Write a protein that binds this ligand. Structure first.
Ligand SMILES: [Mg+2]
Ligand SMILES: [Mg+2]
Ligand SMILES: [Mg+2]
Length: 430
DNA sequence: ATTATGACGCT
DNA sequence: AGCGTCATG
């Protein structure tokens, strides 16, 4: 009753750039704008692998993981932009630099946690407090929320998309208790006002459109963000959770899309997130461990405590390349040449990172995959990273992996390597 | 023959 | 430390 916490203490948003690599290419090349298009890596094998798809192309069934030659069968007019190649491998610098552009704008409004190259969480609790003091009990006009959806509304006693959106927003704003500075629904609404402003600033200063979710925690914010894409934002209130979760497949919740979510479904004999409420916390802990069990018990009630970490920069800087099928590396010269290519890209990125961000990596991690192993990584070994020098890094990586060579011959490498990966980690201020 | 990443948990 | 899992531009 009066002591049951409801997880309404924070306002958290998740901002995700719409089809991000596609938008970067469309900004650069206006001929791609408002077209079915996709971004591909490489070209020789089946036209290259698609990694990002504009919403126009998605309407034809084009998806990530498609080969471009297959996507062209669904969408013959599909336009393609290729990722840059440097030192024989894909180079994603253009997109990393664009991400920094966006993250720096977001950081003007609040502390952010970089979750990926194109998404960031925002803790808006204090900004909402501020804006509420400024508003002086003034109601919130729908004009301040021109792209906001209220999940679960309209409900109760027009046939266009935007008309629906506005009816739901009107129902929400009519029920609002604006004289209560501690109303969670009011704080979420002010949070959405701020996120509209943030999204306006991103689009004005970069050209890029994004979607966003606003709720009381990171999991609900991420889920909300996905509800209305693209170029829209969604508010998921605590009250909306029972109906939302009542038909929500467990796999749609971040961290439950893989084996653990499959075991929740199998062991408990349920399908939807809301069904989890019928188990005790001890029951869930017994099946899924203390940590997961407690997390599931709270999360199916809309409650989650994971903080927005103040981290705008990646924790690791890595370079990797697959060598599939026939291209697997089978000679020592081959392995050394590619280790050097990877190390040269890594040195370039590390030197720029040291200049930009006043930090130095201290550990080099070397990972390989060998032909036939089903695991993505077959071997992972770390060594000291003492100098940003590509020849030294590649020699060290070769030293830490050299005893993987089964070959009785010094020159041959067996069994051949299908993946090389170098990662710089454990940064210290400098 | 997706591929190139990146974060975090377990032991 | 090294491995697994999860995410997916
Ligand atoms: Mg995105
Ligand atoms: Mg994203
Ligand atoms: Mg995606």
């Amino acid at each position: 009753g009066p002591h049951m916490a409801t997880g309404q203490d924070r306002v958290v948003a998740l901002v995700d750039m719409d089809c991000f690599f596609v938008q970067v290419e469309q900004r650069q090349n206006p001929h791609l704008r408002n077209k079915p298009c996709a971004v591909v890596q490489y070209k020789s094998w089946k036209g290259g692998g698609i990694i990002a798809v504009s919403y126009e192309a998605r309407a034809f069934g084009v998806t990530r993981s498609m080969w471009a030659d297959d996507a062209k069968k669904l969408c013959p007019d599909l336009l393609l932009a290729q990722v840059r190649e440097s030192r024989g491998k894909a180079n994603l610098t253009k997109y990393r630099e664009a991400s920094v552009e966006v993250m720096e704008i977001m950081s003007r409004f609040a502390v952010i946690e970089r979750a990926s190259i194109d998404e960031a969480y925002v803790d808006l609790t204090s900004a909402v407090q501020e804006r509420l003091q400024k508003l002086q009990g003034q109601p919130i006009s729908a004009d301040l929320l021109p792209s906001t959806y209220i999940e679960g509304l309209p409900q109760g006693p027009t046939v266009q998309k935007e008309g629906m959106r506005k009816q739901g927003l009107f129902q929400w704003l009519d029920s609002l208790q604006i004289d209560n500075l501690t109303s969670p629904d009011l704080q979420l609404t002010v949070g959405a006002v701020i996120v509209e402003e943030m999204r306006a600033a991103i689009e004005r200063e970069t050209g890029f459109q994004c979607s966003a979710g606003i709720s009381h925690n990171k999991v609900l914010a991420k889920l909300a963000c996905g509800l209305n894409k693209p170029n829209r934002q969604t508010l998921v209130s605590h009250g909306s959770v029972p109906q939302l979760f009542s038909q929500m497949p467990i796999r749609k919740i971040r961290s439950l899309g893989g084996k653990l979510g499959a075991s929740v479904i199998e062991i408990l004999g349920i399908e939807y997130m809301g069904e989890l409420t019928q188990f005790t916390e001890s029951q869930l802990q017994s099946h899924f461990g203390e940590k997961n069990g407690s997390w599931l018990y709270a999360m199916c009630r809309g409650i989650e405590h994971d903080p927005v970490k103040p981290r705008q920069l990646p924790k690791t800087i890595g370079c990797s390349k697959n060598f599939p099928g026939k291209t697997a590396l089978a000679t020592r010269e081959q392995v050394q040449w590619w280790l050097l290519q990877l190390a040269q890209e890594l040195e370039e990125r590390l030197t720029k990172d040291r200049n930009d961000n006043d930090r130095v990596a201290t550990q080099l991690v070397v990972s390989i995959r060998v032909q036939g192993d089903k695991r993505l990584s077959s071997l992972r070994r770390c060594c000291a990273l003492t100098r940003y020098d590509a020849h030294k890094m590649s020699h060290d990586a070769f030293t830490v992996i050299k005893n993987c060579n089964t070959s009785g011959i010094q020159t041959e490498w067996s069994p051949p390597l299908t993946m090389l990966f170098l990662c710089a980690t454990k940064f210290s201020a400098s």
